[PDB]
């Protein structure tokens, strides 16, 4: 149902962007940057700083290959969503 829908949206959106520079399971820093700028626009303001996209990726980048794996993306999403849930206590 709704959670599945949300989930397959996350999977799909990630997958296609990850196809551009990466390999479906992993967003390269270009793709992570673009994804954040393009899609996370309300939650994070735009990110010109190729340094910072690399930093926030590097922070989670278990593979150390200048990408972030779907796992790391989900981990990032978890804390971001939790912050938004804390917000949502007082919509």
């Amino acid at each position: 149902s709704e959670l599945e829908k949300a989930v397959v949206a996350l999977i799909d959106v990630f997958h296609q962007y990850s196809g551009r520079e990466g390999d479906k399971h992993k967003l390269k820093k270009s793709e992570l940057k673009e994804l954040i700028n393009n899609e996370l626009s309300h939650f994070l303001e735009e990110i010109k700083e190729q340094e910072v996209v690399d930093k926030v990726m590097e922070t989670l980048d278990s593979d150390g290959d200048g990408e972030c794996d779907f796992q790391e993306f989900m981990a990032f999403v978890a804390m971001i969503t939790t912050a938004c849930h804390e917000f949502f206590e007082h919509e």
Binding site: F43, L44, E45, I47, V52, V56, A83, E86, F87
Partner: peptide
Amino acid sequence: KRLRRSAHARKETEFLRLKRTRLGLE
């Protein structure tokens, strides 16, 4: 001695401010 050499400043703040704001409600 402590010059402003640290170009590697917390530029992250520029964006993460919104996250901090959302955490703020707790």
